[PDB]
Amino acid sequence: MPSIENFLAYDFWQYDVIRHLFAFSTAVFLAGLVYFAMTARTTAPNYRLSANISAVVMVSAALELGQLWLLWNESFQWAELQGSFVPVAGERFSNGYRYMNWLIDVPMLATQLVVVCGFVGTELRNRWAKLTIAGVLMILTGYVGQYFEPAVAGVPGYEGAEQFWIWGIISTAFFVWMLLILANAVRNPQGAPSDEVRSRLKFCFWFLLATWSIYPFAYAMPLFAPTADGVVVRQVIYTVADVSSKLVFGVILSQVALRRSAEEGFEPARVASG
Ligand SMILES: CCCCCCCCCCCCO[C@@H]1O[C@H](CO)[C@@H](O[C@H]2O[C@H](CO)[C@@H](O)[C@H](O)[C@H]2O)[C@H](O)[C@H]1O
Ligand SMILES: CCCCCCCCCCCCO[C@@H]1O[C@H](CO)[C@@H](O[C@H]2O[C@H](CO)[C@@H](O)[C@H](O)[C@H]2O)[C@H](O)[C@H]1O
Ligand SMILES: CCCCCCCCCCCCO[C@@H]1O[C@H](CO)[C@@H](O[C@H]2O[C@H](CO)[C@@H](O)[C@H](O)[C@H]2O)[C@H](O)[C@H]1O
Ligand SMILES: *C/C=C(C)/C=C/C=C(C)/C=C/C1=C(C)CCCC1(C)C
């Protein structure tokens, strides 16, 4: 079944805002990529994998929010007689472009925190092989329950609203579990860090927990408000949870990594940062 976007008529502002936020978190992911590729030579070689990953999750999200921008632009056309952007009769818009490119981001947003915490070799690969299982078994489960939007929302003719709940609870069951490996790789850092860079990991973890709980709120939105200004609101909180969980989180992590690479002894990070 299509999304709940194609069953509604969007006014001028209700459509312009949504395409504007699709262009905004692409002009920002094509700027974060250039920033993360320009000051990736500052972190020490030990924690430069965390800066390379940060440059990967920006190129792998620019094509995620720019291929959805095109899909949003060609799916809807203005209709002056009505006064709204009615859906076109040939193309159907689906937000599932996000959940297919969340397979490159959900793993490589905790793999770059397990790296910053100081985990090397087997201790990092084993903890990556669990997060990359918890992140492709939670997103591939929330991606099955995404297809029952018009059924949970109440569109007449569409049935199967129970699957929206069923395939949504077996996604927060892995989202909670992934936090249990992210909070045992952050409460136990390696390399004997100082008490101030040990309290910044226990901030980068809460900044990852508090931006990953906006996605359960922005999917279950057709349950609550399946309207034009419940789609406008849901593409606001999937961008305030995008530019603040792939960009702000990466920049915050690039400072706690620079603090380790300025107390271990690296000079290009000890001169350019404290
Ligand atoms: C939109 C693309 C991304 C834009 C990100 C903008 C970040 C700057 C916003 C203000 C943050 C204030 O905090 C400031 O952060 C910058 C960047 O992390 C740090 O800057 C330090 O680390 C960065 C990243 O390795 C180096 O390029 C820089 O030479 C160095 O000074 C400062 O030491 C810190 O004081
Ligand atoms: C879309 C591609 C994204 C690629 C991101 C890959 C990250 C996932 C790695 C999982 C764990 C494997 O084990 C870990 O691998 C990384 C990368 O190979 C190694 O990392 C090492 O090699 C890489 C590549 O030469 C260097 O950039 C890095 O500075 C260095 O530490 C670690 O020493 C190892 O402990
Ligand atoms: C829209 C344009 C693109 C985005 C540009 C903006 C990016 C900004 C990134 C930098 C954010 C500021 O950097 C982050 O600030 C918070 C402020 O509470 C600091 O956190 C600080 O306060 C907390 C809360 O008391 C303490 O637990 C922590 O020890 C302390 O360092 C983080 O250690 C630092 O990493
Ligand atoms: C940049 C990519 C990010 C931050 C990915 C975040 C992913 C999630 C938090 C997904 C979790 C989900 C649930 C907890 C319930 C079902 C819906 C999901 C799949 C969006």
Numbering used by the authors: 1 to 274
Relevant lines from the article:
We demonstrate the capabilities of our method by studying the dynamics of the rhodopsin ErNaR (Erythrobacter sp. HL-111), which upon light activation, pumps sodium ions from the cytoplasm across the bacterial membrane to the ouside. ErNaR belongs to a recently identified subgroup of the NDQ rhodopsins, which feature an additional glutamic acid residue close to the retinal Schiff base, allowing ErNaR to efficiently pump sodium ions even at acidic pH. Uncovering the structural dynamics of ErNaR therefore promises to shed light on the sodium pumping mechanism of this subgroup. Samples of ErNaR are activated with a nanosecond laser pulse of 532 nm wavelength (6 ns FWHM pulse duration, 6.4 mJ/cm2 fluence) and jet vitrified at 107 μs and 13.3 ms, to probe the K2 and O2 states, respectively.
We remove monomers that are not undergoing the photocycle with 3D classification, which then allows us to obtain a 2.8 Å and 3.3 Å reconstruction for the K2 and O2 state, respectively, and build molecular models. At 13.3 ms, we observe ErNaR in the O2 state. Transient absorption spectroscopy suggests that the transition from the O1 to the O2 state is accompanied by an isomerization of the chromophore from the 13-cis back to the all-trans configuration. Indeed, Fig. 3d shows that the retinal Schiff base adopts the all-trans conformation, with the aromatic sidechains surrounding the retinal returned to their dark state positions. In the active center, the hydrogen bonding network has partially reformed. The sidechains of Asp105 and Ser60 now show a stable interaction, and Glu64 and Asp242 coordinate a water molecule. These conformational changes potentially indicate transient sodium binding near the retinal Schiff base, as observed for the pentameric sodium pump KR2.50 Finally, we also observe conformational dynamics at a site near the exit of the ion transport channel, which for monomeric KR2, has been proposed to be a transient sodium binding site in the O2 state. The sidechain of Asn95 rotates into the binding site, which could feasibly facilitate transient sodium ion binding. We observe a spherical density at this position, which we cannot unambiguously identify as a sodium ion due to the limited resolution of the map and which we have therefore chosen to model as a water molecule. It appears likely that our map contains multiple transient sodium binding configurations, which limits its resolution, allowing only speculative interpretation at this stage.
